[PDB]
Nucleic acid binder design. Structure first.
Lengths: 1048, 126
RNA sequence: UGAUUUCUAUUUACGUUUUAGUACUCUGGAAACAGAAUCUACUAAAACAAGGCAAAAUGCCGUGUUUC
């Protein structure tokens, strides 16, 4: 459109990106909208990777079997006339250790050994235990194989217990190799074999790929050699692209985190409040290198101060001070304390890398020795058996050391060092980028949710820049929840605490008799936390006086909001009105160090400390607020407070900010970017009197955007906010004005400038992300067999498992309601009568089979005259009638029953206009097949489905609709969900500005929250519309014919 | 049953009346099978209007966490998104009266109009 | 009101299904045996997203991202 001078506010959520465009000088709302998308989930790619690995495992098993087959055909032990059907492999395998085998049974034995060949290394199996680990089972079996071969033990298991297969069939490759080579040394005297034959077969039997070899030639997941393996496993640094990322637990990474911890400490003492170079070195050498997990006590003893004088440390949830521990340093020190080893930082880095990227004790030993270092062989032996080394660092070791210098020689932490250095991502040349690149987000070590939302926000920014020109200011806020589960967690906790506060208010009203407590919840809660004490005078605050004359007491802000910018409970105390009046724009340390106070500062400090110790009535934030002894007139302290309460310093936010600011820096574009703390925006949204409930659609996401945009406006209008404005923008700040009182603060921030105008905005736009991706899940996992009943229908057969589980009442329900659905009901009535007897005997039990097993020790056995019937473990029964399905019966030749899979997943639907009536044909995921560069709709299946819908050859192709495409039915615009019932020509749609569920809820409508529509003779008009990423509508123009070739 | 046997594929949907749930089954892996049913008013191609009770079964709805009162909402959400992306039509049986079809779904099918209702009534939760 | 884990490798024993054999059930028979049923179980051999490559090979791909 027409270029504008504007502020751009961005609200980045887990499923939405709201944008707000406000005029920079007139504060008028230029535009607003939301980009909507589905929440990413790591489980999608997780299942993809797991199924790819399983397919690889099955393929390699089959290939090993076929290679053994080829070897057998080579030595003429297998011909095209060999028959091995009746051969029992266990009997043949044990017989071949003592006698000649038939060529047929010899081949069968070798093949059966090749199919199941045991474990090489337990580290290769990522397992969930049948409840006894594979390592333990191998221990048991090898102890049981002290005088036997695997085949002999398996054969006696078969002859005694009747089973060989299951949990206890886990051996290791060594035992199989022993049995196989003894079998071969026996059979070579009767069959014309080679030593090459024996070597080739044993190799085929025991060989498999390593973690560092990877897939074979031609794989997009593979690598050429070990160097490419390492480089693909690690990745490249964002700022130094030819450097590889460090491992997570390298020594220098732990030292970097430890120096970050030390630079964050604020020590109350006569000397420098910050630890100095010599002091940090002394603490690292004498505490961090002597104690595995350093404590605040040890650090305080090192610098000869007390624990209460040290502030600004990380904390556990038990409230204990937390400090970085040098993992590899103490891991190697416990094996060798030699100065030549543990005091060699690069050597410890190499040891950590080798422990991380190598997954075998033997490979670890070899790669440690290959380091021509001063480590002894026994030291390497001991080191090879270490555990806990996983993960890759964000930075390369080069950047780690570059920042280690700044950590040693300054008191800045990692965030401040990165803000001052302003490193530029160099993996993509931001110099030659015509817009903000989205590929840098793929590098970040981030949750896929935040990754997707960051990419979406970058593209929204690009589109807004293309539409309205370069913005003046960009202000961004990222959602606090990491996913939907975290959102539900926070909702539950907030409902819980609201319930508890309501209970306390209600029983206060019951005990005291006055409803005044209903409007004093904040003062009452502060009274509770302080145990009825005014924390500035330590006098008693009678609950009756507070409830009767609440203005005798005031909520004072501990650190003045003109510097702290903190509006939360952590910066509030219920004090006497006179104390708050006399305190002014000061801190408790300044007010109680003064003539105006009534008590000392040390009395107050002692009280605050003992009050914080007990029952968590003080938060750590509140305690470090009350005992803030620094001069808040110092610019460093003000910068710290702005960075804490006004800026979002989470790693993901910092990475996105760095990317944006770098792109603008490199291209010499003057766009000031800041990321606001969400607590401040919550405060602003509340004081501006926005409703607590968000029940009118996606527009809220855009609303928030405008809100923070409005906030940005404030920070540009007043010079007394300049410092904050320049800290949020990460700009170096140069008789400056300043907010001097809290009333001035409230005048600046609470005043509802243009808030009604924001609430009156009605031209919101919405963009829903369309999904056209082919080759998604094509069919369900479950493999079903079917029967044909008397009436000619096809029923699906379900299995019932866990028959003897304490809580499984499904078989009891089935027997009591519909016994005829069981297959044994019709085909084995005597076993069913046994089962019904057992069910009625313990009918008052939830699972009668469970109690039967516990009382008798017997399972349900198949009916027998001689009581030799087999144990019944699962029961087949009739399910539903077979509707649309995928027939896979051809994979099972001569199968008497049809083998099916269910729920053909749809891809799209194509709408045609046929002699005045609207029809549509459903394109399924199974109908799209990849051909060598591009996905193609199979024309045979497509014409089949067209004919099934009676679509003419002269029918006019109207459009094709994927998920979230905009459809216009009878003049009403919806978004497409998908095909609901292909046979009934029923599609599913939803509203654009709000979900149909909440639309019905607002009107208290109980209708089904799904919009299902029929497309038939009654349909008058069908159109297709689409939007850009900003939600700007346009009708889809063309395509006389449907798309058959897809890019992918 | 008081059903009527018809030709069923040329039937136009007039008004979606109700959506009930009959069974929420745990497959004892991270997945669930949700059986539900729809009550619609429908007009046959011949002109007569019936009330359609259409049964659907959404299988392999992945949910790994143990479901509570604080959790069943997310299971319902995942069931909905799995059902929207797949094929779950089983069959449809028709009635002449809305009261008769409602009685069918009420007693012979044991259907609740709330996912939470069905979860507690079948024992998935409290 | 009250702070990064993405991407990716290797493998074992299971699990579902079909076929064959055996066991279990039923019928006939003196027996040798043969049928009926395909329910329950063991063993082996196969298939396990539809499928596509590739040709003796520790062979490769197929449910992710992005969808303007």
């Amino acid at each position: 459109s027409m270029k504008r001078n504007y502020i751009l506010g961005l609200d980045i959520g887990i499923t939405s990106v709201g944008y707000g465009i406000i005029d920079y000088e007139t504060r008028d709302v230029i535009d607003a909208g939301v980009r909507l998308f589905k929440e990413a989930n790591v489980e999608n790619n997780e299942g993809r990777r797991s199924k790819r690995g399983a397919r690889r495992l099955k393929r390699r098993r089959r290939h090993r079997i076929q290679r053994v087959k080829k070897l057998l055909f080579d030595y003429n032990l297998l011909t095209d006339h060999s028959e091995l059907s009746g051969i029992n492999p266990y009997e043949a395998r044990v017989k071949g250790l003592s006698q000649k085998l038939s060529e047929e049974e010899f081949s069968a034995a070798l093949l059966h050994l090749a199919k199941r060949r045991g474990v090489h290394n337990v580290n290769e199996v990522e397992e969930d235990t049948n409840e006894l680990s594979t390592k333990e089972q191998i221990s048991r079996n090898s102890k049981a194989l002290e005088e036997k071969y695997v085949a002999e033990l398996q054969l006696e298991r078969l002859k005694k217990d009747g089973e060989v297969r299951g949990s206890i069939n886990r051996f290791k490759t060594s035992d199989y190799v022993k049995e196989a080579k003894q079998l071969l040394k026996v059979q070579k005297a009767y069959h014309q074999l080679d030593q090459s034959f024996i070597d080739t077969y044993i190799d085929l039997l025991e060989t498999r790929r390593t973690y560092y070899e990877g897939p074979g030639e031609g794989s997009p997941f593979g690598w050429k050699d070990i160097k490419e393996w390492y480089e693909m496993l690690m990745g490249h640094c964002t700022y130094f692209p030819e450097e590889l990322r460090s491992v997570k637990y390298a020594y220098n990474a732990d030292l970097y985190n430890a120096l970050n911890d030390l630079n964050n400490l604020v020590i109350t003492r006569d000397e420098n409040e910050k630890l100095e170079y010599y002091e940090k070195f002394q603490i690292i050498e004498n505490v961090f290198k002597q104690k595995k997990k350093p404590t605040l006590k040890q650090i305080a003893k090192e610098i000869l101060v007390n624990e209460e004088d040290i502030k600004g440390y990380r904390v556990t949830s038990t409230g204990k001070p937390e400090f970085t521990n040098l993992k590899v340093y103490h891991d190697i020190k416990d094996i060798t304390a030699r100065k030549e080893i543990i005091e060699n930082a690069e050597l410890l880095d190499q040891i950590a890398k080798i422990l991380t990227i190598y997954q075998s004790s033997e490979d670890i030993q070899e790669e440690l020795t290959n380091l021509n270092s001063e480590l002894t062989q026994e030291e390497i032996e001991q080191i090879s058996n270490l555990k806990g080394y996983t993960g890759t660092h964000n930075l390369s070791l080069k950047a780690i050391n570059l920042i280690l210098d700044e950590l040693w020689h300054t008191n800045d932490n990692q965030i401040a060092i990165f803000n001052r250095l302003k490193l530029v991502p160099k993996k993509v040349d931001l110099s030659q980028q015509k817009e903000i690149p989205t590929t840098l987000v793929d590098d970040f070590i981030l949750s896929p949710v935040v990754k997707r939302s960051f990419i979406q926000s970058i593209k929204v920014i690009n589109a807004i820049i293309k539409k309205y020109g370069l913005p003046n200011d960009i202000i961004i806020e990222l959602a606090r929840e990491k996913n939907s589960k975290d959102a539900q967690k926070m909702i539950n906790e907030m409902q819980k605490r609201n319930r508890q506060t309501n209970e306390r208010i209600e029983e206060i009203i019951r005990t005291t008799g006055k409803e005044n407590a209903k409007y004093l919840i904040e003062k009452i809660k502060l009274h509770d936390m302080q145990e009825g004490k005014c924390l500035y005078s330590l006098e008693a605050i009678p609950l009756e006086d507070l409830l009767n004359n609440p203005f005798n007491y005031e909520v004072d802000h501990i650190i003045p909001r003109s510097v702290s910018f903190d509006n939360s409970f952590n910066n509030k105390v219920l004090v006497k009105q006179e104390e708050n009046s006399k305190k002014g724009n000061r801190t408790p340390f300044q007010y109680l160090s003064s003539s105006d106070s009534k008590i000392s500062y040390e009395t107050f400090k002692k009280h605050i400390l003992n009050l914080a110790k007990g029952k968590g009535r003080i938060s750590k934030t509140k305690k470090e607020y009350l005992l803030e002894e620094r001069d808040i007139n110092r610019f460093s302290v003000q910068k710290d407070f702005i960075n804490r309460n006004l800026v979002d310093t989470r790693y993901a936010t910092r990475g996105l900010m760095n990317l944006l600011r770098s792109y603008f820096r490199v291209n010499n574009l003057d766009v000031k970017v800041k990321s606001i703390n969400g607590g401040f925006t919550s405060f602003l949204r509340r004081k501006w009197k926005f409703k607590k409930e968000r029940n009118k659609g996606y527009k809220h996401h855009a609303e928030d955007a405008l809100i923070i945009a409005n906030a940005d406006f404030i920070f540009k209008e007043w010079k007394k906010l300049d410092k904050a404005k320049k800290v949020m923008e990460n700009q170096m700040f140069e008789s400056m004005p300043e907010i001097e009182t809290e009333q001035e603060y409230k005048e600046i921030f609470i005043t509802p400038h243009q808030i009604k105008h924001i609430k009156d905005f009605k031209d919101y736009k919405y963009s829903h992300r369309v999904d056209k991706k082919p080759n998604r899940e094509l069919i369900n996992d479950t493999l079903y067999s079917t029967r044909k009943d008397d009436k000619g229908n096809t029923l699906i057969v379900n299995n019932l498992n866990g028959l003897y589980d304490k809580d499984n009442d499904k078989l009891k329900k089935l027997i009591n309601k519909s016994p005829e659905k069981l297959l044994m009901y019709h085909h084995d009535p005597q076993t069913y009568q046994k089962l019904k007897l057992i069910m009625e005997q313990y009918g008052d039990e939830k699972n009668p089979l469970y109690k039967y097993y516990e009382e008798t020790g017997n399972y349900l056995t198949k009916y027998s005259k001689k009581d030799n019937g087999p144990v019944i473990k699962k029961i087949k029964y009739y399910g539903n009638k077979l509707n649309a399905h995928l027939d896979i019966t051809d994979d099972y030749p001569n199968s008497r029953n049809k083998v099916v899979k269910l729920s053909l997943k749809p891809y799209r639907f194509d709408v045609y206009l046929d002699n005045g009536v609207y029809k549509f044909v459903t394109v399924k995921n199974l109908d799209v097949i990849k051909k060598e560069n591009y996905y193609e709709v199979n024309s045979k299946c497509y014409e089949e489905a067209k004919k099934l819908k009676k679509i003419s050859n002269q029918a006019e192709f109207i459009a094709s609709f994927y998920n979230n495409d905009l459809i216009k039915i009878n003049g009403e615009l919806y978004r497409v969900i998908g095909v609901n019932n292909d046979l009934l020509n029923r599609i599913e749609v939803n509203m654009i500005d709000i979900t149909y569920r909440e639309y019905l809820e607002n009107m208290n409508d109980k209708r089904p929250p799904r919009i299902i529509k029929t497309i038939a003779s009654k349909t008058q008009s069908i159109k297709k519309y689409s939007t850009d990423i900003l939600g700007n509508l346009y009708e889809v123009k063309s395509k006389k014919h449907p798309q058959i070739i897809k890019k992918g | 049953k008081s059903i009527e046997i018809k030709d069923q594929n040329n039937i136009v949907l007039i008004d979606s009346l109700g959506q009930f749930f009959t069974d929420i089954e745990n497959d004892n892996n991270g997945r669930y099978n949700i059986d539900y049913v729809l009550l619609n008013e429908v007009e046959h191609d011949n002109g007569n209007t019936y009330y359609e009770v259409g049964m659907y079964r959404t299988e392999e709805v992945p949910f790994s966490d143990k479901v509570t009162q604080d959790n069943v909402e997310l299971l319902e959400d995942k069931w909905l998104q799995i059902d929207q992306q797949g094929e779950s039509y089983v069959e449809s049986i028709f009635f002449e009266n809305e009261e008769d079809a409602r009685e069918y779904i009420k007693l012979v099918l044991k259907g609740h109009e709330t996912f939470e209702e069905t979860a507690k009534a079948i024992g998935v939760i409290k």
